[PDB]
Design a protein around this ligand. Structure first.
Ligand code: AGS
Ligand code: AGS
Ligand code: AGS
Ligand code: ADP
Ligand code: MG
Ligand code: MG
Ligand code: MG
Lengths: 325, 174, 348, 130, 546, 329
DNA sequence: GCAGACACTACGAGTACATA
């Protein structure tokens, strides 16, 4: 039936075959499940890569719908997970048998980096003592906020960023299941602006399809507000080729015409600053100045002065690069 | 506390060597009939980093996922350690070589590591790095100044590149 | 009653200076749909006088009958905090900075209860109430972020008149929601005219040279000018042209502190200067005013090619003092950096 | 002149204000010709109670009566009504007066010496435009 | 060269042009049943291992109770104060003037052993009350009152009860108040009380330190400890040279219990001769000690005297000592208050500037961690002391004082704020709204006091001129406006004075500022009498109006 | 019949009245028809219309009677701790979607949680929103509104569809201001409206406030450029020329005099930074001097954004531009 | 049948710390 859902939740990989990228990790987890050798897992990686979807597909594969509420204990950062919960419901769930059917139980701890260190220290002997009865899956974005004692007990899988070559067919499946007219440059802009994230590629696809009705390069870069590659090349050419006043006028006209933001301009100019074969003394100064300009934009600071400083960081090094020869 | 340590004999365990891990892993392999090669067990010892739990977990994961222990089967599921490359990028920052340091930083960024984990490994390497003491203190102060910005909300590749540029500037400015 | 409070004007038509702004403020508040106001200017310019004149123009003469109201507010840490409030039958005057870092609890709890309720009598009182948030530049950004939806939701029944010295300490979401009213300091002629009218209403005679020297020494602060004129009247009734004007102790203590800085550049002198700066911070002097006095006295001793560097160091350590929490570290760092620069300049 | 004047028992009104304390922080008083309706809408749910036509009792202090015509619906705070019901046993009855913009008036006729009045301003209504 | 004058042939390029318009191109692309400590525990006075001065002082202090406990007249620097208190006499209640003995020192010395041996040596029965008890004030009271206020249940010949309170520094402040109340009941205390702690500078024991016979334990001598360990090894049949025993002694920081436990683990029965490399290894016997604040400051500000000469070992040693000491803010305050008192060789003040930059870095990190709730920024302020070790390391002998300036300044600022609020709350609310307390403090205080102090002759108002009467009327009007008055104050020198009841002179005046003429006693008494008659005249005028 | 200020009288009641934000308005108008509304993250400069757009969308979607049952609006004026997110927001998201519109208009089958001013929420309270947004997405929607997207954590950035509210261009802002002035029977000249849209800098709330205050000041007569310059706090060009002449003099006493004269006249330091920046980028200085001076201007603006003192920052900026102007002399 | 005494858990309050 038709449902009113966001496309990041309407199109969720309910099975392990619907995830795209981490084929070796998913093959190893599938062979863990099929041989009943599932250990305590530690899924870590950047957001939007499919860790919660992986553990929910594994839990739906392991357990039927008539027994899913008694075998799976799913706790996350929206739940209270203090040390009284580790000593309370989690220990009682781990230390007791099942109700309906005999089997091993699963305690999913989503956002395990949000737990306090007291709870993580209390979890160690709960994990180690009841390995036969229950299994634990810790999922985090930052591995440093998990204590090394819990990192030793759980085998860790790095759910790295999704490569855009493998991100395309899932987006094509979502497009063909939603009747969306998309061009090749629209798909390329989607997998460029996503940057290893399938949430942001679905959100941007749904937002562009609602705003314009078609998904092309211009529509995606207009709905997102991101500058194009040609605009960044023009900004760099103006900052390296002419004086302060003409470059300031041209960049100000380009920003007023297309409604660009200085954060995305700074990000793309930072990406361009390493491809350009600059001297090493020039690159250090440019990176320090651009990091300072990016830091100044985090508060109530006028963006026009920061645009002038972004021009100034290159107008300083123009004559240095030229006289270097 | 000090009275409890005075009331007991304080035995201290050190990290297990590669031969000590290898002996127990060969015992587990001969008990489990795991086919293997020498580079695979070398990769397991490399990914264990003195941890027998991680050695057994990585061996069981590789044997369940692939059924054979070579280097690429281990590294398709396991991961190389972070400080082994963070030490190289800090060494590149000591010699004011910003290009190789940014190459290692971008390699760690494309692997999905958050800025907090990267700057934690950078501080961990710089705490015990072998260099001048005053330069080490300047490095640690610049790491803390960057980490305040990382914790306050701004955490991009430009901020880490600016941190690397400031670390390379600290060398050339006595 | 002193001369600062005896001859304060009561209505907008009785202001000695900024008369065009007085007419514009009378035309602004006549209809009753005027937005929130942000009265900003230097200290002693006459901001609070114009705010009370705006309140008289809005309500009756009952805004001069004020009273102290005490409120107890519960923090999220469950610490009961007592806050005083100047109140009338038409308006309230709150200074949330007395709660310090808990000022947000004043904004989230005490202010919104004022905003969410309509008035008792709508005939003697008007259709709206006024809340005067005094010294909003000392508010934390959490309180200023708690202020904005209260200012936007209930602005048809509660108007607000924020008062500050510098609008740079007010966040742009708050400054976008209110009309900014600038009250500049009166000039030397305006202060001389005010002092002459006060002395004529007291039945005294004031020379023009003495009034010019009072306006020069007050640094365009009319409150300090009136206090200095009354102190000069007390200490010597015949007004001589070269009469000695009394001075504040913390200002001359700051001058002696900067003389002690510039006299010797040693760590022992730095430890003595740090003791003097604790003495200054002990008496509840704000550290930015200590930094301004130190700069204003140390620039009289520097050469022409050092004043820019000294001013840049003073601004840098003032900004680092604002970013931090212990003022003595940044004050002593500024003094040590100036001592190093001064020693380098004098030995070379 | 108030648009609604009603009479209530004092202890019953104190119990009514106390029962809505555990539900929400702001109560709604409605007064039509039928009687007086107390409501308390919160995150838990609405608690609605009514009093009407209690003149068939032996005691003269339990006669809940209506005396005016125009119905009113006004939202008030809870703590001020609790402090108003802190002065209950001085009088046998209590009188409530309401209008479109006039504040709620809670009147006690304390024996023979005199009387006590409470004025409570209503809350600012939400933006319920169509 | 990264910059090419000629454009590239195949690779992509990016132009760079200077201000003079010349183009450049860049590339875009039961011996076995017990422990050895319990087996070799001292049971007599002659086999103790503590300092003999402390043993004699504790024995003499316990023998001072024989006149009131056993009912017999005859029993059978820091040292000078103890010797004076041992011979200071008795109160008329036949007791020593210090009724409680406090034993303090580092762990592993023999404080509990000395207390038990001295109590059993003087004919007392030891009553122990340690940290494993409940330590609530009711339980503390009902145990001290039971142990001290009763006689023996064995009748005649029963031993008296000597209450030994172990680990008193872990007790709450209310339990110490209960102990002091039972010590100062005049319900008279008739039995000696011995308190044993590990840190004398705890905040809960300071009120005890003003009343107790403070006995401080020095660390044990290495020669006696080496001889005792040699005797233990000879009793157990193990051979060890005194050099390796001295190595254990310096490894465990003169801890008897740690050395005996280390020998018990290291001997076992496999080998008889102990080796140097077994003690020198860090695997057995090394424990983390809690360094004192003064030891950390001495390690930071002074180099170790002459391997250990490398700077990296000193770097890690100072870092680990400052990390293991604890109380980080106290270390920061001590470094802030002690680094300018040294004989600094940096005459250009660059080291002072970078030290103050490091202090500001610490302050910014503390503010950011307490603002953003991100406490993973709290790994860097541990490098604040070690930075000072790179800046101000000297071979001299610095005199390190305890930090007091940031607490004294905070207390004075709090009292100044209380005085400001007390001044502000007395003014009328009509004039309170016209000025903030900050502007009233900065602008309207010294000039206000100059207004309030005119030139007045010490003569009666009757002889004053009409102008002087008008000036006095203005003076009492502005005194009554701000609710300021003069009241009489007592002095130990015998002279009454008049002072303002809100003492705003300490708000206004400064220490090093030139002196000004104060008002005389007659003028201030005249002002006080005038303000009293003006208040009563104002009351009569308000009664006449109403 | 009480008067109301024009910022609330001309608030957009429907989504058709929102100006210049065409992409988010088109998304919300598609969601009005019945399209799948995703989670929203509005971010941009102040006064661009982030709150008004979502309130107009909620009023169009639910009508008057369902606003209290389908919309939970939490802002920084109320307590949003970890327990408010864990208890209040989760229990609101777990509620049923009941209640239908009585006027026959269609009603969407979800609730809306408007977490306005999400900058002030902590990282733990933002981390507690993640599975609340993901798990309860069938029955509720979330709209985080902020000014800085860097202060919102990357999981919440990923979970929401990001829309940046651009500053309003001079065409759309001038058209809206002329429509408001036409509806209020006030006349404003072309120079006045040009200076108004120059001064307001894409802040439509500031423009409406300035237009209302200029109407109240003049009484309803013609609004010229002079009243806009008076009420906008714009420093005259004579003061800027005097500052630049004091910097070209090379003497610090005249620099202190002009800085003290600008401070005593109560001029805001942000306005002085803007006008000095325009003069510096629009003169014939060298590129190196312009570069250093604009970098110092950016640093001074950052320092003033952190609540530093105006006098010291302005005297540091004036010392820097004096050094640059006297370097070539 | 009703007043007094017993332990019982829920709740209010004070304090510390949060890193490698
Ligand atoms: N590998 C993937 N294959 C298909 N869809 C994906 C994949 N990764 C992410 N998605 C989409 O993103 C949604 C949410 O992914 P999640 O399971 O939350 O990812 P995650 O990496 O666990 O995110 P965090 O780290 O918890 S914010 C899914 O329901 C899909 O719509
Ligand atoms: N002369 C001695 N020969 C051998 N062992 C001894 C000797 N004196 C003391 N000991 C042992 O060393 C330890 C002395 O510590 P205790 O007196 O019990 O407590 P403490 O010395 O106060 O140290 P703390 O602070 O309580 S850990 C005990 O284990 C004694 O058995
Ligand atoms: N795009 C717009 N279209 C129409 N009126 C607008 C627009 N933007 C702002 N306004 C007007 O300005 C007022 C302020 O709009 P808001 O929506 O509160 O701005 P904002 O986005 O909330 O700014 P912040 O970030 O909360 S300070 C509205 O009530 C309208 O009167
Ligand atoms: N127009 C005026 N005529 C005479 N005196 C004035 C006038 N305006 C202000 N003053 C006096 O100057 C002082 C300014 O203080 P205040 O009104 O509180 O302004 P601020 O809040 O800026 O210090 C007041 O004490 C007042 O008596
Ligand atoms: Mg997830
Ligand atoms: Mg002991
Ligand atoms: Mg808003």
């Amino acid at each position: 039936k038709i449902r009113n859902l966001p496309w990041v939740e309407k199109y969720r990989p309910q099975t392990l075959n619907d995830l795209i990228s981490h084929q070796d990790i998913l093959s190893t987890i599938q062979k863990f499940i099929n041989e009943d050798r599932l250990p305590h897992l530690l899924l870590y990686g950047p957001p939007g890569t499919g860790k919660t979807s992986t553990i929910l597909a594994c839990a739906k594969q392991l357990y039927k719908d008539k027994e899913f509420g008694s075998m799976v204990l799913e706790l996350n950062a929206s739940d209270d997970r203090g040390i009284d919960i580790i000593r309370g419901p989690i220990l009682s769930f781990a230390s007791t048998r099942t109700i309906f059917k005999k089997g091993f139980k699963l305690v999913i701890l989503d956002e395990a980096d949000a737990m306090t260190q007291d709870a993580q220290n209390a979890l160690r002997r709960v994990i180690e003592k009841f390995t036969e009865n229950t299994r634990f899956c810790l999922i985090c974005n930052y591995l440093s906020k998990i204590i090394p004692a819990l990192q030793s007990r759980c085998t860790r899988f790095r759910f790295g960023p999704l490569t855009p070559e493998l991100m395309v067919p899932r987006l094509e499946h979502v497009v063909e299941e939603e009747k969306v007219d998309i061009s090749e440059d629209g798909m390329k802009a989607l997998v460029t602006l996503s940057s290893g994230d399938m949430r942001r590629a679905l959100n941007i696809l749904q937002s562009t399809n609602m705003a314009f009705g078609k998904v092309t390069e211009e529509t995606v870069y207009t709905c997102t507000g991101h500058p194009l590659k040609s605009d960044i090349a023009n900004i760099l050419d103006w900052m390296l080729n002419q004086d302060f006043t003409t470059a300031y006028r041209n960049i100000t006209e380009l920003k007023t015409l297309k409604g660009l933001a200085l954060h995305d301009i700074l990000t793309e100019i930072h990406l361009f600053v390493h491809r350009v074969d600059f001297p090493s003394s020039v690159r250090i100064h440019l990176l320090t100045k651009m990091a300072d300009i990016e830091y100044r934009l985090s508060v109530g600071t006028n963006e026009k002065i920061q645009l002038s400083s972004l021009i100034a960081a290159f107008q300083v090094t123009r004559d240095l690069i030229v006289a270097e020869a | 506390i000090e009275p409890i340590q005075s009331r007991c004999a304080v035995l201290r365990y050190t990290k297990l060597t590669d031969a000590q891990i290898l002996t127990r892993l060969m015992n587990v392999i001969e008990k489990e009939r795991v086919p293997y090669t020498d580079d695979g067990l070398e990769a397991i010892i490399f990914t264990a980093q003195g941890d027998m739990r991680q050695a057994l977990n990585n061996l069981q994961s590789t044997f369940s996922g692939f059924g054979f222990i070579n280097s690429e089967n281990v590294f398709k599921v396991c991961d190389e350690p972070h400080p082994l490359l963070v030490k190289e990028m800090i060494q590149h920052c000591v010699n004011a070589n910003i290009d190789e340091a940014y190459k290692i930083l971008a390699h760690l960024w494309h692997l999905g590591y958050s800025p907090e984990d990267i700057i934690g490994n950078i501080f961990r390497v710089c705490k015990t790095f072998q260099m001048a003491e005053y330069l080490k203190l300047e490095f640690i102060k610049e790491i803390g100044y960057t980490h305040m910005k990382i914790a306050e909300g701004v955490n991009s590749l430009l901020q880490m590149a600016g941190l690397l540029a400031r670390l390379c500037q600290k060398t050339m400015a006595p | 009653s002193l001369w600062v409070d005896k001859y304060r004007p009561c209505s907008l038509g009785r202001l000695d200076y900024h008369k065009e702004q007085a007419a514009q403020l009378r035309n602004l508040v006549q209809c009753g749909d005027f937005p929130h106001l942000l009265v900003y200017g230097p200290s002693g310019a006459g901001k609070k006088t114009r705010i009370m004149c705006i309140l008289r123009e809005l309500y009756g003469v009952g805004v001069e009958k004020l009273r102290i109201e005490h409120q107890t507010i519960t923090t999220p840490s469950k610490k009961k905090i007592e806050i005083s409030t100047i109140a009338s039958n038409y308006h309230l005057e709150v200074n949330p900075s007395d709660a310090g870092n808990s000022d947000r609890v004043v904004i989230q709890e005490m202010l919104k209860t004022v905003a969410q309720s309509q008035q008792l009598e709508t005939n003697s009182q008007r259709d709206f109430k006024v809340v005067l948030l005094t010294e909003v530049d000392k508010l934390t950004k959490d309180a200023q972020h708690a202020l904005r939806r209260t200012m936007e939701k209930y602005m048809s029944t509660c108007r607000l008149i924020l008062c500050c010295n510098s609008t740079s300490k007010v966040i742009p979401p708050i400054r976008s929601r209110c009309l900014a009213v600038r009250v500049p300091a009166p000039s030397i002629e305006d202060i001389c005219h005010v002092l002459s009218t006060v002395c004529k209403k007291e039945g005294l005679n004031l020379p023009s040279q003495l009034a010019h020297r009072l306006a020069e020494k007050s640094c365009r602060n009319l409150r300090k000018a009136l206090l200095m004129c009354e102190a000069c009247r007390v200490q010597q009734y015949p007004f001589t042209a070269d009469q000695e004007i009394p001075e504040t102790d913390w200002e001359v203590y700051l001058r002696e502190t900067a003389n002690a800085i510039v006299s010797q550049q040693t760590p022992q002198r730095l430890l003595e200067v740090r003791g003097r700066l604790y003495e200054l911070l002990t008496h509840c002097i704000p550290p930015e005013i200590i930094m301004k006095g130190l700069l204003s006295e140390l620039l009289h001793n520097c050469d022409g090619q050092l004043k820019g560097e000294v001013a840049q160091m003073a601004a840098y350590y003032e900004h680092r003092l604002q970013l931090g929490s212990k003022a003595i570290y940044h004050l002593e760092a500024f003094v040590a950096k100036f001592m190093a620069l001064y020693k380098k300049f004098m030995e070379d | 002149e108030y648009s609604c004047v009603v009479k209530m028992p004092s202890g019953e009104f104190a119990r009514i204000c106390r029962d809505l304390s555990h539900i929400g922080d702001a109560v709604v008083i409605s007064c039509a010709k039928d009687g007086v309706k107390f409501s308390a809408s919160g995150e838990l749910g609405n608690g609605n109670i009514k009093l009407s036509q209690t003149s068939n009792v032996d005691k003269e202090e339990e006669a809940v009566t209506i005396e005016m015509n125009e119905p009113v619906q006004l939202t008030f705070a809870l703590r001020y009504l609790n402090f108003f019901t802190k002065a209950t046993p001085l009088s046998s009855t209590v009188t409530l007066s309401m209008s479109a913009d006039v504040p709620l008036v809670v009147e006690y006729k304390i024996a023979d010496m005199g009387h006590l009045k409470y004025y409570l301003a209503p809350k600012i209504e939400d933006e319920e435009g169509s | 060269n990264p910059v090419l004058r000629r454009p590239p042939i195949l690779e992509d390029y990016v132009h760079v042009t200077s201000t003079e318009g010349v183009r450049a191109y860049l590339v875009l692309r039961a011996s076995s049943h017990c422990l050895w400590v319990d087996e070799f525990a001292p049971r007599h006075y002659t086999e103790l291992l503590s300092d003999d001065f402390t043993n004699r002082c504790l024995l003499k202090w316990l023998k001072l109770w024989d006149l009131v406990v056993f009912g017999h007249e005859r029993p059978s620097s820091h040292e000078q104060v103890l010797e004076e208190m041992l011979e200071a006499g008795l109160d008329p209640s036949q007791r020593p003037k210090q009724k409680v003995a406090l034993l303090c020192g580092p762990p592993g010395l023999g404080k509990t052993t000395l207390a038990h041996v001295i109590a059993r040596h003087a004919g007392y029965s030891v009553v122990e009350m340690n940290a494993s008890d409940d330590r609530s004030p009711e339980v503390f009271r009902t145990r001290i009152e039971a142990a001290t206020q009763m006689e023996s249940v064995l009748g005649a010949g029963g031993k008296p009860n000597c209450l030994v309170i172990d680990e008193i520094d872990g007790a709450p402040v209310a339990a110490i108040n209960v102990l002091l109340s039972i010590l100062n009941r005049k319900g008279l205390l008739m039995r000696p009380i011995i308190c044993i702690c590990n840190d004398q500078f705890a905040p809960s024991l300071r009120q005890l330190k003003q009343q107790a016979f403070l006995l401080h334990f020095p660390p044990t001598l290495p020669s006696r400890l080496v001889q005792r360990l040699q005797e233990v090894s000879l009793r157990q049949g193990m051979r060890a040279d005194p050099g390796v025993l001295a190595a254990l002694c310096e490894k465990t920081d003169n801890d008897i219990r740690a050395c005996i436990n280390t020998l018990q683990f290291l001997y076992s029965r496999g080998q008889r001769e102990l080796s140097v490399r077994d003690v020198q290894a860090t695997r057995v016997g090394l424990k983390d000690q809690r360094r004192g604040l003064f030891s950390v400051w001495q390690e930071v500000f002074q180099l170790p005297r002459a391997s250990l000469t490398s700077a990296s070992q000193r770097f890690y040693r100072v870092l680990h000592a400052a990390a293991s000491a604890g109380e980080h803010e106290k270390v920061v305050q001590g470094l802030f208050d002690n680094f300018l008192r040294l004989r600094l060789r940096d005459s250009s003040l660059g080291a002072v500037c970078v030290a103050l930059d490091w202090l500001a870095f610490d302050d910014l990190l503390a503010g950011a961690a307490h603002h953003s709730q991100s406490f993973q920024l709290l790994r860097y302020p541990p490098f604040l002391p070690v930075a000072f070790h790179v800046l101000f390391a000297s071979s001299h002998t610095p005199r390190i004082t305890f930090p007091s300036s940031q607490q004294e300044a905070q207390n004075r600022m709090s009292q100044m704020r209380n005085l400001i609020q007390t001044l502000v709350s007395g003014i009328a609310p009509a004039t309170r709204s016209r000025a903030t307390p900050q502007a009233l403090l900065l602008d309207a205080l010294c000039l206000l006091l100059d207004i309030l102090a005119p030139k007045l002759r010490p003569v009666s108002t009757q002889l004053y001129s009409t102008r002087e009467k008008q000036q006095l009327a203005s003076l009492v009007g502005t005194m009554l406006a701000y609710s300021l008055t003069y009241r009489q104050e007592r002095t130990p020198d015998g002279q009454y004075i008049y002072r303002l009841e809100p003492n705003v002179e300490e708000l206004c005046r400064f220490p090093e500022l030139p002196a000004r003429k104060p008002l005389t006693y007659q003028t201030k008494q005249l002002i006080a009498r005038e303000i009293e008659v003006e208040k009563m005249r104002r009351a009569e005028a308000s009664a006449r109006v109403e | 019949a009480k008067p109301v200020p024009w910022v609330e009288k001309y608030r957009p009641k429907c989504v058709d009245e929102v100006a210049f934000q065409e992409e988010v308005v088109a998304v919300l108008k598609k969601s009005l028809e019945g399209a799948d509304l995703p989670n929203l993250l509005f971010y941009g400069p102040p006064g661009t219309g982030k709150t008004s757009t979502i309130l107009a969308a909620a009023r169009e979607l639910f009508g008057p009677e369902l606003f209290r049952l389908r919309v939970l609006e939490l802002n920084a004026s109320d307590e949003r701790g970890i327990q408010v997110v864990r208890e209040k927001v989760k229990n609101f998201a777990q509620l049923t979607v009941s209640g239908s519109r009585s006027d026959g208009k269609p009603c969407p089958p979800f609730k809306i949680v408007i977490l306005d001013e999400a900058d002030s929420m902590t990282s733990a309270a933002q981390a507690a929103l993640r599975r609340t947004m993901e798990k309860e997405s069938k029955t509720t929607r979330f709209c985080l509104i902020c000014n800085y997207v860097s202060r919102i954590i990357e999981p919440l950035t990923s979970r929401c569809s990001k829309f940046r509210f651009k500053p309003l261009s001079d065409k759309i802002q001038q058209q809206r201001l002329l429509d408001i002035a036409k509806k209020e029977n006030v006349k404003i000249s072309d120079e006045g409206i040009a200076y108004l849209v120059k001064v307001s800098e894409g802040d439509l709330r500031k423009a409406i406030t300035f237009l209302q205050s200029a109407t109240r000041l003049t009484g309803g007569k013609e609004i010229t450029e002079k009243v806009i310059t008076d009420i906008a706090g714009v420093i005259p060009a004579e003061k800027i020329d005097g500052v630049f002449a004091a910097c070209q003099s090379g003497s610090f006493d005249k620099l202190e005099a002009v800085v003290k004269d600008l401070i005593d006249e109560g001029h805001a330091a942000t306005q002085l930074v803007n006008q000095l920046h325009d003069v510096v980028v629009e003169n014939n200085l060298s590129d190196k001097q312009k570069s250093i001076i604009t970098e110092k201007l950016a640093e001074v603006d950052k320092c003033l954004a952190d609540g530093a003192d105006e006098h010291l920052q302005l005297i540091s900026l004036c010392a820097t531009v004096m050094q640059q102007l006297s370097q070539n002399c």
